[PDB]
Design a protein around this ligand. Structure first.
Ligand SMILES: [Cl-]
Length: 358
């Protein structure tokens, strides 16, 4: 059946939970949200279980997420994840656990204030500062193993249907990994080595998942441009930021090597936008997966509703037009909507999705 997913982001309490330190209210906020999503045809919840090197689940590896209580590491008095999963399943909805692999801190947060048992505190060798934030080093084999193991815990212990990574990889062109490169890089072009570091993580996460539960899917949602045609003649007829260059996310390699089961390019632009034309990009991405077994879903930017903050771009108003176009491409297998709150908070969006999905 067609994929009809919504992202439920927990970072900064974006979509869920609205309330901290109140188990009953958090539970009701979630079921009410699922009910509204189901009512418009959403069949899959993609829920951020690791927003910030943390866990919205009981873990022997990673600390409780601050977004449940206000305090990182604080036990909220229940494990939310069984509830999040079981309530999705009772409504006939699939559940994909979404992880951010490398993030550790937000801007200006002190690394020294993490909980004692935090992996980044126990393993200072793993941590790289970039600007005013800290990250796990994608180039360390121990870091990759730790991420694999962190996901494997969730696969083993919870009835998930999928594992999902979003679009954050290396945080910028530069990154203070010279020592890592010297030790492990074999003199390879450094940027190619960084791309391969990310590829290796994806490969190893997929393999781990399959060795436990073969039918659990693994997917990634990268940024919507891989390379512009101006950098690579087989790239897209677009301008602006490229995932290949800017975060070392080589989505084409992932597809060609079968490192993922599904891919969700974030096409958060209107049809006709010169720099990043939705209509050109759906075609480009459909062609990328042709002849592979990688499922293509389009990331839909319904959060853009004409605000000046987005230069007046209004994706929500044209969502029927976008999905109608998607459906012209047999390689496109559905959509993921950013984000759940936008569906919940808008009667117009609800009406449009009902008309697409009923
Ligand atoms: Cl290898």
């Amino acid at each position: 059946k067609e994929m009809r997913a919504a992202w439920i982001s927990t970072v900064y309490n974006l979509d869920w939970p609205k309330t901290k330190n109140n188990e009953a209210k958090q539970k009701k906020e979630y079921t009410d949200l699922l009910d509204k999503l189901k009512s418009v045809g959403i069949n899959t919840a993609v829920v951020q279980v690791r927003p910030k090197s943390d866990a919205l689940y009981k873990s022997n590896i990673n600390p409780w997420s601050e977004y449940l209580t206000g305090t990182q590491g604080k036990d909220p008095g229940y494990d939310p994840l069984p509830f999040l999963i079981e309530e999705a399943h009772k409504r006939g909805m699939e559940f994909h656990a979404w992880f951010n692999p490398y993030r550790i801190t937000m801007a200006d947060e002190s690394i020294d204030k993490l909980p004692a048992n935090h992996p980044a505190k126990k393993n200072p060798s793993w941590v790289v500062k970039h600007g005013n934030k800290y990250y796990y080093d994608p180039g360390l084999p121990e870091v990759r193993k730790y991420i694999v193991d962190s996901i494997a815990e969730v696969v083993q212990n919870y009835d998930i249907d999928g594992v999902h990574f979003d679009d954050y990889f290396y945080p910028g062109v530069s990154f203070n990994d010279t020592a890592t490169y010297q030790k492990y890089g074999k003199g390879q072009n450094k940027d190619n080595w960084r791309r391969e570091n990310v590829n290796t993580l994806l490969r190893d996460v997929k393999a781990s998942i399959k060795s436990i539960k073969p039918n659990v899917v693994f997917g990634v949602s990268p940024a919507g441009i891989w390379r512009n045609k101006s950098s690579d003649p087989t790239g897209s007829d677009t301008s602006g930021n490229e995932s290949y260059v800017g975060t070392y996310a080589d989505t084409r390699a992932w597809i060609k090597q079968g490192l993922i089961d599904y891919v969700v390019p974030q096409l958060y632009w209107p049809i006709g936008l010169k720099a990043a034309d939705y209509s050109k990009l759906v075609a480009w991405w459909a062609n990328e997966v042709k002849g592979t077994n990688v499922d293509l879903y389009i990331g839909q930017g319904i959060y853009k509703q004409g605000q000046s903050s987005y230069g007046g771009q209004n994706i929500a108003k044209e969502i029927v037009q976008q999905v109608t176009l998607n459906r012209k491409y047999s390689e496109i297998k559905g959509s993921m909507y950013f984000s759940a709150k936008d569906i919940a908070n808008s009667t117009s969006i609800q009406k449009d999705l009902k008309s697409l999905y009923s």
